Amino acid sequence: TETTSFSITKFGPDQQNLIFQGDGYTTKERLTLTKAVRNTVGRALYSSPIHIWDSKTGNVANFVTSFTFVIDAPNSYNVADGFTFFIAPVDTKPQTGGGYLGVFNSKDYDKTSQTVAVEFDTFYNTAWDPSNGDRHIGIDVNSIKSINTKSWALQNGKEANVVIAFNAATNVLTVSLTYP
């Protein structure tokens, strides 16, 4: 049996147990993935690799993560691109920016990506997002094109609490976002 667990309630200026990529850095005891500026990417990864499944036993891990985040846009119409929680190879590096959320490169299923992300998408990219143009929560596996989506109404500058859980026995990934 293997477990990895951690919690960070307040981010310090030098949070050495995280790998920062792009413009991600910590400030005012928050992890700032992007500032309100055009064309940026910011990522932050937990430093330890996590053992999610094992080929010699075939067992697969359960996991739970919860975090609070804020999207702070000028007005609730001028806002893009969104935020992701992702699971990727140990060597992951920023991929395409903009509507691909720094995590994928195509709307075409790419088996070499081997990353799944839960996105909180604020900008409608016509080529792959739900036709209705809404903001949404979606589950992505190997492409920016979600396998499934739920419309979500952004509350600008409001903190959202999210829990994401995966249970190996049922292979069910559960996403929950609440604005309190």
């Binding site: 477990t3 951690f6 993935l33 055009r38 499944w53 036993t57 975090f67 806002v79 190879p89 900008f123």
Partner: protein, 47 residues
């Protein structure tokens, strides 16, 4: 106000045995500040 989504995703078919987890956010022609305030994680893998 809550929003929930549930899906069956057999992770074993998609991700390597060892992974790094994390957050990502971007802006493009349009923008917003994206910030995380706290983060709890726990995984358990039977052997």
């Amino acid at each position: 106000t809550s929003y929930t989504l549930n899906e069956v995703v057999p992770l074993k078919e998609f991700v390597p045995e060892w992974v790094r987890i994390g957050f990502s956010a971007t802006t493009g022609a349009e923008f917003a500040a994206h910030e995380v305030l706290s983060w709890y994680f726990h995984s358990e893998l039977a052997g």
